[PDB]
Amino acid sequence: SKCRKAGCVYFGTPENKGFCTLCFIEYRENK
Amino acid sequence: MALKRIQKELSDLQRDPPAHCSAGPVGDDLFHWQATIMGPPDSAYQGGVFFLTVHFPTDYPFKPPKIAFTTKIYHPNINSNGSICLDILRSQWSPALTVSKVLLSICSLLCDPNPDDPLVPDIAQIYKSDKEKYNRHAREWTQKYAM
Amino acid sequence: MQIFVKTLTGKTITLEVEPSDTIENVKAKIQDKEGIPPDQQRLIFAGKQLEDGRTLSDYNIQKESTLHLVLR
Ligand SMILES: [Zn+2]
């Protein structure tokens, strides 16, 4: 369940649309 | 076959973690692992934590894992490239040994350096000729790099 | 859910946690059990140093998982 971001070592979560927590916030702010 | 072995070892480290060493995968890839050695009490590397990198050969456990230090260390047997001069990682390897077992031996190596098989002879020369200047230099190297 | 925290002394502490808990949450939780102020804790999991501000779900810390704890 690795985070969707190419070069990311952290694990994601379905509730974060597959992103690890900080990539999600990176996604939501960019989004 | 190796995928099973690696998994088995990983289950064990969840069942009985060796107190000062921790190992596990980088991302979801089981073939590349990252591991740490807590600095041994009563050794010059005390308190410091030391990050390593372990890659399993596809024909594991028959060929030994390739283990390097990512953290810098003043040790006669560990060079600037983080290479570890240990015989159980070269010729004395046996598929009966695990990563748990090796990590402890690397820890023992910090405890009792091999002065007659020196990757960095400069440092080994100090460990014979000036035991305390070694203990002095290793401590700085633990504090700047491992704290 | 349940986890294990293993210090260098040998003793293993058992902790009740959730996947969405942060490191600050965890370092505070061991203060409740043992009494080690959060600033003096160093937590590791399976080869990776945990960074305050990230959750357990990031590091894939699940049930029965074990965190090593260095006493700074
Ligand atoms: Zn990510």
Instruction: Tell me, in angstroms, the distance from the centre of ligand 1 to residue B48's CA.
Output: 28
Instruction: Tell me, in angstroms, the distance from the centre of ligand 1 to residue B53's CA.
Output: 21
User: A8: annotated binding-site residue?
Assistant: yes
Give the resolution in Å.
Answer: 3.4
Partners of residue B33 on adjacent β-strands: B25, B54
Domain range summary for chain C, segments of one domain joined by +: 1-72
Instruction: Tell me, in angstroms, the distance from the centre of ligand 1 to residue B133's CA.
Output: 45
At position B105, the amino acid (one-letter code) is S
Quote the CA–CA distance of B9 and B139 in Å, as a whole number.
33
Domains contained in chain A, number? 1
Partners of residue C43 on adjacent β-strands: C69
Instruction: Tell me, in angstroms, the distance from the centre of ligand 1 to residue A24's CA.
Output: 7
For C60, the token pair is 């894939």
DSSP B67: E
Which technique was used to obtain these atomic coordinates? Answer: X-ray
Phi, psi of B33 (to 5 degrees): -125, 155
Compute CA distances C4 → B45, B71, B136, C20, whole Å: 26, 26, 36, 17
Residue C53 to chain A, least CA–CA distance (Å): 9
User: A14: annotated binding-site residue?
Assistant: no
Inter-chain residue contact A2 with B28, CB threshold 8 Å: yes
Helices (H) and strands (E) in chain A, counts: 1, 0
C48 in contact with B, Cβ within 8 Å:
yes
- Please, how many CA atoms are within 13 Å of residue C2, restricted to the half-sphere of its CB? 4
DSSP string, C24-52: HHHHHHHHHHT---GGGEEEEETTEE--T
User: Using a CB-CB distance cutoff of 8 angstroms, which residues of chain B are in contact with residue A9?
Assistant: 26-27
At position B73, the amino acid (one-letter code) is I
User: A6: annotated binding-site residue?
Assistant: no
Task: Go through B32-58 and write b for each residue having 16 or more CB atoms within 10 A of its CB, e for each that does not.
Answer: ebbbbbbbbeebbbbbbbbbbbbebee
Q: Which fold has domain C1-72?
A: Ubiquitin-like (UB roll) (3.10.20)
Beta-carbon neighbour count of residue B132 at 10 Å? 9
Specify the residue for token string 């937590």: C43
Q: Is B10 left (phi over 0), alpha (psi -120 to 50) or beta?
A: alpha
Inter-chain residue contact A1 with B26, CB threshold 8 Å: no
Q: Which residues of B are catalytic?
A: 85
Specify the residue for token string 């748990």: B100
Distance of CA C24 to the CA centre of its chain: 9
B102 in contact with C, Cβ within 8 Å:
no
Specify the residue for token string 């050695």: B37
For B39, the token pair is 């600095």
The overall longest dimension of chain C from CA atoms, in Å, is 29
- Please, how many CA atoms are within 13 Å of residue C7, restricted to the half-sphere of its CB? 13
Quote the CA–CA distance of B92 and B84 in Å, as a whole number.
14
Enumerate domains of chain B plus CATH numbers.
1-147 (3.10.110.10)
Phi, psi of B95 (to 5 degrees): -60, 0
Selected residues 22-41 of chain B with any CB under 8 Å from a CB in chain A:
26-28
Q: Would you state the torsion angle of the CA atoms of residues C43, C48, C53, C58, taken in this order, to the nearest 10 degrees?
A: -120
User: Using a CB-CB distance cutoff of 8 angstroms, which residues of chain B are in contact with residue C48?
Assistant: 24, 34
| Segments forming the whole domain that contains residue A13 | 1-31
Quote the CA–CA distance of B89 and B77 in Å, as a whole number.
13
